[PDB]
Design a protein around this ligand. Sequence first.
Ligand SMILES: Nc1ncnc2c1ncn2[C@@H]1O[C@H](CO)[C@@H](NC(=O)[C@@H](N)CO)[C@H]1O
Ligand SMILES: Nc1ncnc2c1ncn2[C@@H]1O[C@H](CO)[C@@H](NC(=O)[C@@H](N)CO)[C@H]1O
Ligand SMILES: [Mg+2]
Ligand SMILES: [Mg+2]
Lengths: 136, 136
Amino acid sequence: MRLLYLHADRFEYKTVKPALKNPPDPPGEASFGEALVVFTTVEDGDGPQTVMYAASDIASHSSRLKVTTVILYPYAHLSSRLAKPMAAHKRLIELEGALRTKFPGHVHRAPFGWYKSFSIACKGHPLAELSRSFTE
Amino acid sequence: MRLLYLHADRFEYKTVKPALKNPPDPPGEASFGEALVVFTTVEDGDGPQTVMYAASDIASHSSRLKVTTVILYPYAHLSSRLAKPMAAHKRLIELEGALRTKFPGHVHRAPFGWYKSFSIACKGHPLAELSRSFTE
Ligand SMILES: Nc1ncnc2c1ncn2[C@@H]1O[C@H](CO)[C@@H](NC(=O)[C@@H](N)CO)[C@H]1O
Ligand SMILES: Nc1ncnc2c1ncn2[C@@H]1O[C@H](CO)[C@@H](NC(=O)[C@@H](N)CO)[C@H]1O
Ligand SMILES: [Mg+2]
Ligand SMILES: [Mg+2]
């Protein structure tokens, strides 16, 4: 699993066209104030152990930033070892569920299988942009 | 070299604190309208051949999107095989120079060695977010 953590002042997205024949989540749009935005690329080897490590890490980082909103944003572009779309969707559902057991704030999982527009205002402090890898 | 291509309606950044002992570029800030924003991670094996392939690709993609501004945005977070900071800075200067020989619009290389805030409004069409690898 490859993640990018962006500490945002604000974030919003809108699904536009479908990117899979039948996107497994409905279309939608949402906007947020301050948040940790986690761009999340699910990889071929990812399983339950991977999901739990990433959930732990996201919670730990969120705590250190003092953020109370996490956005789990599915993202196909951070890796060249992608899991197939249905497995990736399952692992993202699992990550959202695991994160809720470790982090007390708002957890928003953005819809999977859509092309999306987005806007982000990313903070510029030293911990505002980090990347992470998890495996098992 | 690992790149992320984001087709933006607007982009802006500001250097904040230095991220290297002596950043090789001055502090600064800039904002743009529609542009191709290229987050660029220089990797250990990158040399002149790599730079030329990436410059060709960026020009080709820009043409297909009908964009007339490219932002070359140094980014440490897209790879786990980073070139050292001074080599990365040299390859980014080279990429900017090579791109000008292939693409006729505005080429802006953002300062290297700074933590930066940024804001982007990324389009949501099917070619608005792509990633690329180059090697030699
Ligand atoms: N292995 C994987 N890891 C994470 N997300 C994955 C994935 N495989 C498919 N997706 C999702 O399907 C959309 C089309 O690739 C993806 N959409 C996107 O990546 C948008 N940000 C493009 O605008 C994403 O929702
Ligand atoms: N191998 C490499 N490829 C691309 N850029 C590289 C690099 N090694 C160092 N940098 C630059 O040094 C700043 C601190 O890592 C980096 N700064 C950043 O990546 C900001 N976006 C953080 O706010 C970047 O300017
Ligand atoms: Mg809509
Ligand atoms: Mg300033």
